[PDB]
Design an enzyme around this catalytic site. Structure first.
Site, short mmCIF file in Angstrom:
data_model
loop_
_atom_site.label_atom_id
_atom_site.label_comp_id
_atom_site.label_asym_id
_atom_site.label_seq_id
_atom_site.Cartn_x
_atom_site.Cartn_y
_atom_site.Cartn_z
N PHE A 215 0.84 -1.19 0.00
CA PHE A 215 0.00 0.00 0.00
C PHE A 215 0.88 1.24 0.00
CE2 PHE A 215 -2.09 3.45 2.20
CZ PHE A 215 -3.37 3.46 1.68
N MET B 268 1.62 -4.98 2.49
CA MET B 268 0.36 -5.70 2.34
C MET B 268 0.56 -7.01 1.59
SD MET B 268 -2.80 -3.14 1.54
CE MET B 268 -3.87 -4.57 1.38
#
EC number: 1.11.1.-
Lengths: 440, 440, 440, 440
Positions: free
Chosen positions: D32, D99
């Protein structure tokens, strides 16, 4: 190996044949009363010279079927036609001996020189053996040949003994040019033939080939021994030479009728010479056509000249390295991919020693035909037609009906080996491919 | 819009492109490290001048696929070939900038000027950037370019900043000829490209185009800025002009490398002038084609000469009266009604100042033809295709597939203004209509 | 996601769009020079309120195609028509901003309010921006707008900076209602648009919508900021309100033109209120349909009245106990097991606070569908179809093709949580299940 | 390039991806709020090291679709599953960042390590970020993450500025390890994502991966920077290492969260090392199995030892000449044709530099399978099954059901290139072929 040429009653008529070696096809048609194995001295030599040797036994002779019908040169030539078509021979050379010369003349006359590259006549019957009013250059009258037939019928086995005496000129050549055992073998082969065929064959000798001669358009060779007792030189070859003046004329001094064995060295020399000359001759007229078409798509400049030179070199037999040629092509500037593809196709096809080079990526991607399924469909339809085709001129015309895109993919099919077409046909495709591109 | 030019692994390689306007096709090939949108100042001008503008993004640049292969001018030119063939462009003008000049040179050299009418080279790399012994006219040695590649690899984002500093000559031109926002956008476009393409591109700059130059036969234009920092004028354009003496040479004073934006006014002026020569040249060839086709159906005599003269007069722009011509046509003997119809169609289409003249009865009845419903249905079927069409060559090709009767009715559909097609397309129809009639 | 709205040359014209959430469709039409993503603050709020948000980019803007044609409100409205018809939206609400208001007015006028439930105009152009003799309430004369176009053509990138200065009223709002980064993004979106579209767009601003206004029959909302610099309140909304007095009028004090972001809170509140009236209106019509269908299977008596009351109560939002309802359902003596199952499914689906109640045994055993493997197979096939479906009417139609036995098991799939369908679709299934049962 | 992983309303959910280079597949899963392009420093290095690099953008990030649903690791892993299966990757390495580490853990846990060779976790979330009673090693409580989401919702664009400040540790690294322009690009990528996805993603960070960890059986790598501000080393990697002690643990001193760029050199080194070790490790266990099976058919003697040595050498990477190997094979005494065929198949398959050697005659004739059409039929039926297969152990079992004659022809199909199967499957066939022969 056998090829079915007819049917007699419950049985079928098959001819024994042999297919050896790789190269341009040379068909050897034996004489009376032997078989294909008679050519062994020539076959051994022709194989060394890198030819494809094809021999077969005439009906009722050697290992072939022995029917009691069809002993005429129209049937003999029909059989030869079946053989050539069954094997699908193209750009082949016909070589006949004794009776075999008649088959060559008749086939050429009756079926055309489509599949034929050149012809050879050794110890020929031509033009006409029968001595009549209209033909004073005949060897003997009708009554004479009737005597021969009756002699065979009298005693087929005893006839052979006297036959081979003049066939080889044994008084001269026995113990010198032909061994006792060799003649023994010839006799065995004679006995192996059909009893009916034995006496039926001599009647075919006085066949009038005078009408068949003019239909000979391919390069010709006439060879004959001066000491020929069976077929006197003056009544055969000499008058034959007047009928066919274009033909290469060879007179072997002191050679008998069965010179195929006795004077094998002189025969091979003359024959291999004639074949090599006719072979390079058909290569040049075909390759120069290929050259002009291939060069038509290459843009004018120093590169165009360079390509033409390397093309002439490989065509001449100057076996250049292929890994180098392909790399020279690959790293070459200004060359279009399709052009590189076409040239890559031509080079692998014309270069003898393939060396062991994988189907190049740059060639395959050029020939893929963008991956259009419509192009791939038309390519298969054309491939079916080219499988049937044999002539170069014939192959180019039917290919021209297809689009340049379809043609490129068709070449790709063959290159990738999903296709099996003859070199003459293969050249037709590439020239047709070049022609469409040239019109853009 | 995308055009597939290749395949990389599981993915395919597509190039982003744009097709705007109607007229002669002008292909704009961008440079490093931007995209097709860089031409926006030229494109806007070219669209106003009634051209067909085609732009595309190089692989790994702009909105195009970003593969990690095929970063060489042979692949770049192959991509361009695909684009031109996919769009089926004919009589088109290639305009290249920076790297884009290389594509033009290589394509023309490798694929021929078949589809090409003319070429333009702005801020050219040619003939050879690399400084070596055999090429002292190089800009810089091998070691230099290796530095650039390593510089991009170090940090491409930081590289772009320093790059655009000399691309636009910002110390001079910033705030005067180029705004901060304009440069800002250019930076975004640069970063938007492929990471691999970024560092792969500089290696292509020292490509040897010396062999490609002689293959340029179409009219050429060489434009370059004197203040070019990236590609110094003397090492590029000046020596390029010696290699290509036929080319129109323009030197823009004080212009930087990215003169496409900064000196857009000077660029447009020079380019539109050069283009206008190529544009007027093919406009004339279009009218001469229509003339020959139309005259093909008129029977030989003094009337044919009379028609040909009046055709040349209207094509030349000589304000002929239309009511008079039409009354002249209607009353001519010897002329077939269809012939009168075709001519009437051509005259209404070509004669300026129609002055509000109602659709002639004799033309409408002439184009109706047979009254065959097959002719009427196919005419509508053809009319639908022609509305989508834009090129004259494209319109003529698709029209030829229809029968002469269907074509006449299709012309009738347009004449009754129940149809709206462009003049180039309308001419395609009449030539195809004339062609079918002549071939029967 | 894209929708094709036309064709330009070799390329097609596609509009980028987004379809999110489930409920009544709300179409958000962006303004100049941004894209659909501009609504992001509204979309977030509308998605929370259980709406189906549909946004798209105008031609030559955002991620849409950038053609050089069709820059007029007749074409803009045609595009919107295509969008609405392709998605087959029914009873939808159109919400427009800046330029987007023009599309709403024109589409409603030209295509009718068939698919439309209501309309909203935020920062409207209406009724007429051009200042002329017949229209003194115009904001500026022809010459002014010609200046903007010429300004964009000069340098659109530099133009964008100055444009957003008055678009957001940055002197006031920067650092307060809009951040530097937010503006940066807005600028990027502007630059991302088409160069041609950029300069073509301003000419559309002075479009005469005065004739389109009376054709608005659906409920309307007119919102506008008083601090609007781009479109002055008195020349736009105020006079627009006189033309459409029926419309709900909202004036946001001190809000600039780009109030969608700056005064997002005031905008959302006003918009969701206006929308809620139309949404609750369509929710009831959905629930009354479900009620009639569910009651259709219940046998007449005092029990039928009791169920209808408890249904109305949960639909109204009267938080009834579910544990009690389910025990009440389970214990009914005249209700069929399938009937108990269906009602149980409906109650768990409509009751908000499920309160963590475990999947009831009596409902599962009703919905299992006699554990026929044939019934279970058809249910999955239907479930696959329902997973793709979104509308209630659409879900009901495709479900009707399946047998009552297959439908019950499919409901069991969803109830057991082996399936994931939207509430509107889920109701379609249950209504379809009831319809089959009613017909026996 | 895109891969469809779902459907949201009228639109479908597609993920943007890139497939570069040739070799063993290395999948790079970004964090992210970036995209696949973030890996550019690793991708460049991995391509140099001869790997196949596969990157894709998570839903709502980069160029991928931006739906408003499915933002959970079960859906993220389901998407990854689609990607791996769509591309049909086998023996691949998964590498995750931020992530991305979660996707790796979940996929391995939920879908098994069938297609997976090894795994790498860079800047991992694992095992559990949420700070609770049961998990005191958490980084922060629930209320904390709720703050992050609200921050993104407040102003998505302004959030990114502050985010990248701690992502790269700019106070330290800016101007040293990361440039101003590089961060600028990261921000652009961030803005490019979905508005919904932006605020939806942080909720996924406190996912409990503790249950996923034990299911990791393939070799693992855990890399993490000590100066990681986003994911504190002690709450993440250190406790992760205790959960997975088998894993190779690397702690990069002073590296921030976004160490992929700043400390790219240290990251690449560690990563390329781990990959090379895991690569040679899977080659040895597979090739030793192939060796024993191939040697099983070779008769005991000095020749058997010679073969084993040359096999070990090519397996070790001692790229021996292939023309020599094939000639050594061809001219080797005591070797059976089938044995030569099998070995020829293995050598072309295992030897990297194919050099460009044509499919040998001696290999093709061994593999032909006598020309029995029954053998050719069973070979195609098996070929269909092997196309679906992926594992080596899986490929050998299904092949064993076929006769030795059918197996030989199947190998011939692949060798001749009428077939396209993966190397692991290809090895399964040959081992199965050896097994049947060994039992004779």
């Amino acid at each position: 190996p056998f090829i079915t040429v007819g049917q007699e009653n419950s049985t079928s008529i098959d001819l024994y044949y042999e297919d050896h070696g790789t190269g341009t096809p040379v068909v050897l048609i034996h004489g009376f009363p032997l078989s294909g194995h008679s050519w062994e001295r020539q076959s051994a030599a022709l194989l060394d010279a890198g030819y494809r040797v094809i021999t077969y036994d005439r009906r009722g002779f050697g290992q072939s079927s022995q029917p009691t019908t069809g002993y005429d040169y129209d049937t003999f030539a029909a059989d030869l036609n079946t053989v050539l078509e069954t094997l699908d021979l193209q750009d082949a050379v016909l070589v006949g001996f004794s009776m075999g010369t008649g088959e060559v003349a008749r086939y050429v006359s009756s079926y055309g020189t489509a599949r034929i590259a050149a012809v050879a006549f050794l110890a020929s019957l031509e033009p006409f053996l029968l001595k009549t009013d209209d033909n004073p250059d005949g060897a003997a009258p009708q009554e004479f040949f009737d005597g021969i037939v009756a002699a065979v019928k009298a005693d087929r086995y005893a006839f052979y003994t006297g036959f081979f005496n003049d066939f080889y000129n044994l008084d001269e050549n026995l113990g010198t040019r032909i061994s006792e055992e060799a003649v023994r073998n010839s006799w065995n082969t004679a006995a192996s033939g059909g009893f009916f065929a034995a006496a039926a064959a001599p009647t075919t000798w006085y066949t009038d080939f005078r009408a068949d001669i003019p239909r000979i358009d391919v390069p010709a060779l006439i060879l004959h021994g001066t000491g020929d007792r069976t077929l006197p030189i003056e009544n055969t070859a000499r008058v034959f030479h007047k009928a066919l003046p274009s033909a290469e004329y060879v007179e072997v001094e002191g050679a008998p009728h069965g010179l195929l064995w006795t004077h094998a060295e002189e025969v091979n020399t003359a024959l291999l010479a004639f074949l090599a000359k006719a072979q390079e001759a058909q290569k040049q007229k075909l390759l120069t056509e290929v050259e002009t078409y291939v060069l038509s798509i290459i843009p004018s400049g120093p590169l165009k000249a360079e390509i033409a030179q390397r093309l002439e070199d490989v065509f001449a037999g100057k076996n250049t390295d292929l890994e180098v040629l392909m790399e020279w092509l690959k790293t070459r500037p200004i060359l279009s991919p399709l052009t590189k593809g076409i040239l890559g196709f031509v080079f692998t096809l014309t270069v003898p020693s393939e060396r062991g080079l994988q189907r190049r990526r740059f060639v395959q991607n050029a020939l893929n035909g963008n991956g259009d399924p419509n192009n791939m469909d038309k390519a298969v339809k054309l491939y079916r037609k080219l499988k049937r085709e044999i002539t170069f001129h014939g192959a180019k015309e039917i290919s021209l009906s297809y689009s340049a895109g379809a043609l490129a993919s068709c070449m790709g099919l063959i290159y990738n080996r999903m296709g099996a077409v003859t070199t003459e046909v293969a050249f037709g495709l590439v020239c047709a491919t070049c022609e469409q591109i040239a019109d853009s």
